[PDB]
Amino acid sequence: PAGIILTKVGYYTIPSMDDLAKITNEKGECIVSDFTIGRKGYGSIYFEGDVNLTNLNLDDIVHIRRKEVVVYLDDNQKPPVGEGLNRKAEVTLDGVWPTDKTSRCLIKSPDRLADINYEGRLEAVSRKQGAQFKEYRPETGSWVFKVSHF
Amino acid sequence: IYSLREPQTPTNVIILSEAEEESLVLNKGRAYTASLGETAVAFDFGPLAAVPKTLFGQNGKDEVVAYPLYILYENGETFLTYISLLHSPGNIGKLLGPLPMHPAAEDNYGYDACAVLCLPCVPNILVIATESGMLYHCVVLEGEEEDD
Amino acid sequence: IQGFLKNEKDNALLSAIEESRKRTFGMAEEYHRESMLVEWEQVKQRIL
Amino acid sequence: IQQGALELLRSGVIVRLAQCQVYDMRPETDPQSMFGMRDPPMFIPTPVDRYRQILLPALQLCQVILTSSMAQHLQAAGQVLQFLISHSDTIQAILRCQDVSAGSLQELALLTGIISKAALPGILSELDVDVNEGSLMELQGHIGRFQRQCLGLLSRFGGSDRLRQFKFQDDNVEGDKVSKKDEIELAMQQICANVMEYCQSLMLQSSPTFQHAVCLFTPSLSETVNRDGPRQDTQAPVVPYWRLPGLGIIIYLLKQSANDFFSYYDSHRQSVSKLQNVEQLPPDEIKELCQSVMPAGVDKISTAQKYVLARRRLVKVINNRAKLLSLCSFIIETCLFILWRHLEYYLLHCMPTDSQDSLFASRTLFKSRRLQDSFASETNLDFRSGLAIVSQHDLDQLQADAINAFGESLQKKLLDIEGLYSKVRSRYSFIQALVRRIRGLLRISRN
Numbered sequence: 001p002a003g004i005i006l007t008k009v010g011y012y013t014i015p016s017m018d019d020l021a022k023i024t025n026e027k028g029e030c031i032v033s034d035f036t037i038g039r040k041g042y043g044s045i046y047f048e049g050d051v052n053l054t055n056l057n058l059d060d061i062v063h064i065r066r067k068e069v070v071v072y073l074d075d076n077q078k079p080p081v082g083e084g085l086n087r088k089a090e091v092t093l094d095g096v097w098p099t100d101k102t103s104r105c106l107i108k109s110p111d112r113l114a115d116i117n118y119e120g121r122l123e124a125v126s127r128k129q130g131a132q133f134k135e136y137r138p139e140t141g142s143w144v145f146k147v148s149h150f
Numbered sequence: 151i152y153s154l155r156e157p158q159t160p161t162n163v164i165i166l167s168e169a170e171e172e173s174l175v176l177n178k179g180r181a182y183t184a185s186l187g188e189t190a191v192a193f194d195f196g197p198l199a200a201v202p203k204t205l206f207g208q209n210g211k212d213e214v215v216a217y218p219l220y221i222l223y224e225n226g227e228t229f230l231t232y233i234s235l236l237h238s239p240g241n242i243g244k245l246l247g248p249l250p251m252h253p254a255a256e257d258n259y260g261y262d263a264c265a266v267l268c269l270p271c272v273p274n275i276l277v278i279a280t281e282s283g284m285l286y287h288c289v290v291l292e293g294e295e296e297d298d
Numbered sequence: 299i300q301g302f303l304k305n306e307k308d309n310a311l312l313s314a315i316e317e318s319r320k321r322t323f324g325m326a327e328e329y330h331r332e333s334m335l336v337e338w339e340q341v342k343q344r345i346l
Numbered sequence: 347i348q349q350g351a352l353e354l355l356r357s358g359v360i361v362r363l364a365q366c367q368v369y370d371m372r373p374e375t376d377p378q379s380m381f382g383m384r385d386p387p388m389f390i391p392t393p394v395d396r397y398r399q400i401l402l403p404a405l406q407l408c409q410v411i412l413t414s415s416m417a418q419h420l421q422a423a424g425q426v427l428q429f430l431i432s433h434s435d436t437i438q439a440i441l442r443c444q445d446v447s448a449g450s451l452q453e454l455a456l457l458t459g460i461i462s463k464a465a466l467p468g469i470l471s472e473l474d475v476d477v478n479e480g481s482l483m484e485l486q487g488h489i490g491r492f493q494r495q496c497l498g499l500l501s502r503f504g505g506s507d508r509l510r511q512f513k514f515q516d517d518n519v520e521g522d523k524v525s526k527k528d529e530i531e532l533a534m535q536q537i538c539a540n541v542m543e544y545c546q547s548l549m550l551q552s553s554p555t556f557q558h559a560v561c562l563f564t565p566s567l568s569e570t571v572n573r574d575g576p577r578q579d580t581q582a583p584v585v586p587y588w589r590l591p592g593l594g595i596i597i598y599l600l601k602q603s604a605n606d607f608f609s610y611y612d613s614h615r616q617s618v619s620k621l622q623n624v625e626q627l628p629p630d631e632i633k634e635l636c637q638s639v640m641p642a643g644v645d646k647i648s649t650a651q652k653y654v655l656a657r658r659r660l661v662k663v664i665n666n667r668a669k670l671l672s673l674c675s676f677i678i679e680t681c682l683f684i685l686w687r688h689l690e691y692y693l694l695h696c697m698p699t700d701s702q703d704s705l706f707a708s709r710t711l712f713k714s715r716r717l718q719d720s721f722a723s724e725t726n727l728d729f730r731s732g733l734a735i736v737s738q739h740d741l742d743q744l745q746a747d748a749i750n751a752f753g754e755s756l757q758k759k760l761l762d763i764e765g766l767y768s769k770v771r772s773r774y775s776f777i778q779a780l781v782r783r784i785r786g787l788l789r790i791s792r793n
Contacts, residue, residue: 063175063178063179065172065179067179067182067183067186067188068178068179068182068183069179069182070178070179070181070182071178072178073175073176073177073178074176074177075178093182096186098186098225098258098261099225099227099248100254100258101226101227101248101250101251101254101255101258101259102250102251102252102253102254102255103250103254104248104250107258112256115256115257116256116257116258116261121185121261122185125184125185126185128184128185129181129185150178207581207583207584208583208584208586209584209586211586211587211588238374238376238377239377239378240377323402323403323406326406326407326409326410327406327409327455327456327536328669329410329413329414330409330410330412330413330459331536331669331672331673333413333414334413334459334462334539334540334543334676335672335676337416337417338543338676338679338680339771339772339773341546341550342679342773342776343772343773345683345776346773346776346779
C-alpha cells in the first residue's frame with residue numbers, strides 16, 4: 001500500500017512487508033517505530049525511533065553484500081540528516097571473518113580471533129570511520145556498530 | 151598504466167577486486183572494506199620472467215616473457231600479476247593469489263601492511279613492511295604439483 | 299577551375315601508375331600458379 | 347623473364363631484400379580494438395595495410411624469381427631461403443597468425459608458395475661454400491621450423507575448422523561480405539595447394555628408392571571418422587604444431603576439394619552466363635556488382651558505366667572461380683599422389699615397432715669421450731628419430747579405416763571430376779591411374 005518497493009534476492013524487513021501493509025494509514029502514510037531491514041546471512045540495519053517509509057524503493061536505496069552495508073548510494077539522491085533513512089542507525093554485518101594467510105580459508109576459531117585481537121582492530125577502524133563500535137560475535141562473524149547518518 | 155605519448159588515457163587497466171556479474175549498482179561501501187584491510191596499498195616489480203606454460207592454451211610454443219608485479223593489501227595479503235607491453239592481452243594480466251605465506255602465523259603476520267620491495271635475485275626475495283616497523287623476508291617459490 | 303583541373307591530374311597520374319603496378323602484382327600470383335601447374339605438367343608424366 | 351631473374355640474382359636483389367628492416371616492423375593488431383567505432387574509408391591506409399603494401403611486393407618478387415628460374419638454379423632457392431631466415435621470427439609470426447582477413451591469407455598464400463620451392467633438401471647439399479657446421483645446423487633448425495608450421499596450416503585450412511572460420515565472418519558485418527568471400531575462399535585453397543606442392547616435392551627429392559621415402563603424415567585416419575554426432579563446444583585443444591598430422595587430413599582435404607570443385611564449377615558456369623546476359627540482369631544485381639567495385643557513388647554513374655563495372659566484376663569472379671577450379675584439380679591429384687605413396691610405404695615397406703628382434707640394435711654412443719684426433723666422416727643428423735612409434739595396431743587400423751574412408755562414393759566423384767575437367771589438360775586418366783593403384787594397395791591383405 002505505502003508505495004514501498006522491495007524485491008532483490010535474500011532481503012527482508014522487521015516488521016514484515018505484509019505487516020508494514022497493515023500499519024499503512026488510510027491516506028497511504030506509513031510510519032514505523034524501531035524498523036529493521038537486512039539480507040539473510042549477510043547483515044541488517046536497525047533504526048532506533050520513528051521512521052517514515054512512504055514511497056521508498058529499498059532495492060535502490062539500501063545495499064548489503066559480504067563486507068559492504070550502506071544507504072542512499074547515489075549521494076545526489078541522499079535526503080537531509082534525519083529524513084527517510086539518512087539518520088542514526090545500529091548496523092550488523094555477518095560472516096565478517098579475516099583470511100588465514102597460509103591455508104587461505106576464513107578464520108573461525110573465537111580463540112584465534114582473540115589471538116589476532118580482531119575485535120580491537122574492528123573498534124580501531126570503527127573509530128577511524130567515526131562510527132561507534134558495540135560488539136563482535138566470532139561464531140556468526142557479526143560486527144555490530146552505531147552510525148549517525150549515511 | 152599510462153603512456154607519456156597519450157598521458158590522459160591508460161595503455162592498460164587492471165582491476166584488483168573479484169567483482170564480476172553483479173553490475174548496475176552505485177558506489178558507497180569504501181568505508182567497510184578498508185576496516186578489513188581490503189585496500190591495495192603498494193606494489194613492486196621482480197626481474198623479467200618466462201610465463202608459466204599452464205596460463206596459456208596448449209597452442210603456443212614461443213616462450214612469452216613478462217614482468218611479475220607483486221601487489222600488497224592493507225590486511226597484508228599479497229597478489230601477483232604478469233604484465234607485458236609487448237604481447238596481446240590473451241590471459242596476460244590475470245590476478246593470481248592470495249599468495250600463501252609459510253610457515254603459518256597465529257597473529258596472521260600483522261594487519262597494518264604499508265610497503266613492499268621485490269629484490270633482483272633468483273629465487274625472488276619479497277620484503278613486506280608494516281606501520282608497526284616489522285619487516286618480513288619472503289622467498290618466492292613456484293607451487294607444488296599434487297599427486298592423484 | 300584550377301583546383302578541379304589540378305586535382306583530376308594528381309588523380310590521373312596516380313591512376314596510370316596504379317593499374318601498371320596492380321596488373322604486374324596480380325600477374326605475380328598467376329605466374330606462380332601457371333609455373334606450379336607447368337612443373338606439375340612435367341611431374342605426372344615422369345610418373346605415368 | 348628467365349634472363350631477368352638471373353640478372354636480378356647477379357645484382358643481388360634477394361641479398362638487398364635481406365638487409366631491409368621494414369619487413370620485421372610488423373604492426374601489433376590489438377584484438378580488443380573490435381569494439382571501437384565505425385571509421386569511414388579514409389584516404390590514408392592503416393599501418394597494417396601499409397605494411398602489406400611493403401611486404402606483399404617483396405614476397406611476390408621472391409616467388410616470381412622461383413617460377414621463371416626453373417629447376418637448374420639451386421642458387422635462386424638458396425638466396426630466397428636466406429631471406430626467409432634473416433626475417434625468420436616474422437616468417438614464423440605470419441605462419442602463426444590466427445587472423446583470417448583476406449590480407450593475412452594473402453600473406454600466408456604467397457609465403458607458402460615460396461617455402462614450397464625454397465625449403466627443399468637438395469639445396470643444402472649443393473650450396474658448396476665454407477659455411478660453419480653451426481650455421482648449417484641453424485639453417486636446418488630454421489627449415490625444420492618452417493616445415494612443421496606449414497604442415498600445421500593443412501589442419502587449420504584443409505581441416506574441419508575452415509567451417510568455423512566462415513561462420514565467425516558470416517555473422518558479424520553485413521554490407522561487405524560478398525566482395526571479400528571470393529578472395530578468402532581463393533587464398534585458403536592457395537595455402538592448401540602450396541603446402542601440398544611442398545609435401546610432394548619433398549616426397550620426390552628425399553629418395554629415388556621407395557623404401558626410403560620421407561613420411562610426412564602419421565598412419566592415423568581418425569580425423570575422417572569422428573564427426574557423425576552433435577555435441578557441445580568444449581574447446582578443441584589446438585594441435586601442437588610440433589606434432590605431425592594424420593593421413594586423415596589428406597583424405598578429408600581430398601573429400602573437401604572433391605565437393606568444393608562442383609560448387610566452383612556451377613558458380614563459374616553461372617558467372618559466365620551472367621557475363622553473356624549482363625543487360626538482362628536485374629537493376630539490383632547490376633547495383634550489387636557495381637557496389638563490389640565502387641562502395642560509393644553508384645547512383646551518380648551512367649547505365650553504360652554500370653554495365654562496364656558489372657562486366658569487370660564478372661570477369662574477376664570468373665577468373666577467381668577458374669583459378670579455384672585449377673587449385674582444386676591440383677589438390678585432388680596431389681592428395682591422391684601423397685595418399686598412394688604413404689599407403690605404399692605403410693602397407694609394404696613399414697615394419698611394426700612391436701617386433702622384438704630389434705633389441706640388439708641400440709645402446710652405444712651417449713657416453714662422454716674428450717678430444718681428438720682428425721677428420722673425414724659424414725655427421726648426418728638423423729631426423730628419422732622424430733617419427734612416431736608405429737605399432738602393428740596402427741597399421742591394421744590404417745588398412746581398415748582406409749578401405750572405409752576411400753569408399754566407392756569418393757572414387758566415383760574423382761572420376762566424374764576427371765570426365766568434366768581433364769579433357770582440357772594433356773593428362774587424361776591420371777586420376778583413374780592413382781584411384782586404380784590406391785584400390786590395388788587396399789586389396790593387399792598382410793599375411
